[PDB]
């Protein structure tokens, strides 16, 4: 039903490009890839996408209180109004903003260390119906912003 820590999930978009609801999911490789990218899950009947570079582990998810503590140095539920620590399941690395541009946005890929704001992504539900202060459930809509660059998961 809901979502706590240490449970396994993917993200996905359904980008309707050329009016095709392309069920493209996130995909970062590691071990020689320092970037995330996409992965189509629409044609499951003939091209099964790989899952391993798409699974992501909810290591932690607190508010500003705990966050400030960590920077100033088994089922915690995950809340609209939290920034979380998210690991890549396969590589073990930690997804974050990357400080290059390839326009004036910022790149997206793995890193090791949990220091800095980069490994933190604040959760906002993109509806008035949901709001901050309650658990994230099965299959909810959400908006993630960086904490280093404070730009959107775009």
């Amino acid at each position: 039903q809901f979502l706590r820590t240490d449970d396994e999930v993917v993200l996905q978009c359904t980008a309707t490009i050329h009016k095709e609801q392309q069920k493209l999911c996130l995909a970062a490789e590691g071990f020689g890839n320092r970037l995330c990218f996409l992965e189509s899950t629409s044609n499951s009947k003939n091209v099964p996408p790989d899952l391993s570079i798409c699974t992501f582990v909810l290591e932690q998810s607190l508010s500003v209180r705990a966050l400030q503590e960590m920077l100033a140095n088994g089922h915690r539920t995950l809340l609209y109004g939290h920034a979380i620590l998210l690991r890549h399941s396969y590589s073990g690395m930690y997804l974050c903003c990357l400080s290059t541009s390839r326009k004036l946005a910022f790149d997206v890929g793995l890193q090791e260390d949990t220091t800095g704001e980069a490994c933190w992504w604040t959760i906002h539900p993109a509806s008035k119906q949901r709001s901050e202060g309650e658990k994230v459930r099965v299959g909810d809509d959400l908006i993630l912003v960086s904490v280093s660059s404070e730009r959107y998961l775009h």
Binding site: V64, R65, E134
Partner: protein, 537 residues
């Protein structure tokens, strides 16, 4: 030499800035001095008491034909039933309403009880409270001073939990049903409050830089909201079970806005605000009076709203707790415990925080009394009881904290007079020792010395480090023990009532010392509390 030049430079500097404003003192202007004297005389002297006259004037007004007071009430009613698409100032309301609201060891208590009842008759026999109700339906979400006047009058009527008024108001709702009324209740509940500490940092930085009419920050008149909730409480004290079910259900109109869940997530929002006030104040360990005062205000808010919460469920009319079974209350309580555990440590430090500690422990007390009132309709394995189990489960660590916290002054209450704790250093005067006291307590096969260090937080810290073997000790003795008795009652009721909960077995033995401490003090019976069950109590 050079230090002489430094002293003369600072000397002439102090003399010059003295010459800037010392002798300038109301100095020139006759007109301005007169004017400012008038302003001070205004701000000081006017400001007095004449104010014994009004109830007398009520008694003059309660005189014969129609009574003129009743004419006035009729005026305000007809004023209320005008449809002005919004509400307005009308200062004469703002005079006369609180004029009436001005107008409200055993035997004498009964006597003044009857005199108060006579006053309450003396108004509401003239149909007084209906226009209060009308006005409150009349504005919608607007929180004007008009609304404050109405709420003051409504509580001043309903002060004793007068049943008669509750009947009248229910019947008023019955015939002339106003979805707009409870609509207005929800809207008035809606914005209504929260402390917003960024503004606190703005003003505290301003006290860094402005040296100034402050205090407007605190939840934007918290007090009015306290009055609203006390009005809700004194609406249903006396177990107006019909009224409790109506406030759930509101059936006679078209629609229903269940105000219960409204005040639930309201106080959830209040909880959120105070929990982030902790996440602010988690590190700085010293609070000056401003934040302390804002704490105390919000504390009274929490106390009031918990009393409303009880009074919804206190007559165990099932639908309240049925709705509240699916409330979002539980996690807010969990975060409350998370507040309490960490708060009590840093509050339990010095001469300052002790008052605020009393505040927290007392709200803590009747907070748990709330879920005691929740608890009372259980059968064998409480479904609701299991909700209490599960919300207890996630609140483990703080529960360990608070149980240690009770164990501290509990074992203080144990050792506090044994002569291997009393005649240890002295015979006894109160002045005993630090380290002999310390090794006394430690030599009692009793403490890891962490507990002693927390006990040696201050314990006197006055020149001698001998404590007061009674005063600090009596500060600890009772004043955290009732709550432990309450939660003991609670968890025993759970475990006894719903058995076979393994984690609950862990929880109960996990501070079993206080339970067996309180076994001299509980009492239990069994009765048939009109559900024809053996309802033990």
């Amino acid at each position: 030499k050079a230090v002489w030049h430094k002293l003369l430079s600072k000397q002439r500097k102090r003399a010059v800035v003295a010459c800037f404003r010392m002798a300038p003192l109301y100095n020139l202007p006759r007109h301005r001095a007169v004017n400012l004297f008038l302003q001070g005389y205004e701000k000081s002297w006017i400001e007095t008491e004449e104010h014994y006259f009004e109830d007398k004037l009520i008694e003059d007004l309660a005189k014969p034909r129609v009574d003129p007071l009743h004419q006035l009430i009729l005026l305000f009613s007809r004023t209320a039933l005008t449809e002005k698409c919004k509400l307005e100032e009308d200062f004469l309301y703002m005079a006369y309403a609180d004029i009436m609201a001005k107008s409200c060891s055993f035997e004498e208590k009964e006597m003044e009880k009857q005199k108060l009842l006579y006053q309450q008759a003396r108004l509401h026999d003239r149909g007084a409270a209906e226009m209060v109700l009308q006005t409150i339906s009349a504005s919608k979400g607007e929180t004007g001073p008009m609304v404050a006047a109405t709420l003051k009058l409504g509580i001043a009527i309903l002060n004793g939990g007068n049943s008669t008024v509750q009947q009248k108001m229910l019947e008023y709702l019955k015939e002339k049903k106003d979805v707009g009324f409870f609509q207005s209740l929800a809207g008035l509940m809606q914005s209504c409050s929260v402390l917003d500490l960024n503004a606190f940092e703005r003003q505290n930085k301003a006290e860094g830089l402005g040296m100034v009419g402050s205090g407007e920050k605190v939840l934007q008149d918290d007090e009015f909201t306290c009055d609203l909730f006390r009005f809700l409480q004194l609406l249903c004290e006396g177990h107006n079970s019909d009224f409790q079910n109506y406030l759930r259900t509101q059936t006679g109109n078209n629609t229903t806005v269940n105000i219960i869940i409204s005040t639930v997530d309201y106080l959830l929002r209040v909880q959120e605000s105070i929990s982030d006030f902790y996440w602010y104040y988690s590190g700085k360990d010293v609070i000056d009076e401003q934040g302390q005062r804002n704490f105390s205000k919000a504390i009274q808010v929490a106390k009031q709203v918990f009393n409303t919460l009880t009074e919804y469920i206190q007559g165990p009319c099932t639908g309240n707790q049925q709705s509240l079974a699916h409330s979002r209350l539980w996690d807010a309580v969990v975060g409350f415990l998370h507040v309490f555990a960490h708060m009590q440590m840093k509050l339990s430090q010095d001469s300052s925080q002790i008052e605020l500690l009393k505040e927290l422990m007392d709200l803590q007390k009747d907070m748990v009394v709330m879920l005691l009132s929740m608890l009372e309709g259980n059968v064998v394995n409480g479904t609701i009881g299991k909700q209490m189990v599960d919300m207890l489960v996630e609140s483990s660590n703080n529960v360990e904290m608070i149980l240690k916290f009770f164990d501290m002054f509990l074992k203080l209450k144990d050792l506090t007079s044994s002569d291997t704790f009393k005649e240890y250093d002295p015979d006894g005067k109160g002045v005993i020792s630090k380290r002999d006291f310390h090794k006394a307590m430690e030599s009692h096969k009793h403490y890891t010395q962490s507990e002693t260090e927390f006990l040696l937080s201050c314990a006197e810290t006055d020149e001698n480090e001998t404590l007061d073997y009674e005063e600090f000790v009596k500060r600890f003795h009772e004043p955290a023990k009732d709550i432990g008795f309450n939660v003991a009652v609670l968890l025993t009721n759970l475990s006894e009532h719903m058995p076979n909960d393994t984690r609950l077995q862990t929880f109960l033995e996990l501070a079993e010392s206080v339970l067996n401490y309180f076994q001299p003090f509980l009492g239990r019976i069994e009765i048939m509390g009109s559900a024809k069950r053996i309802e033990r109590v």
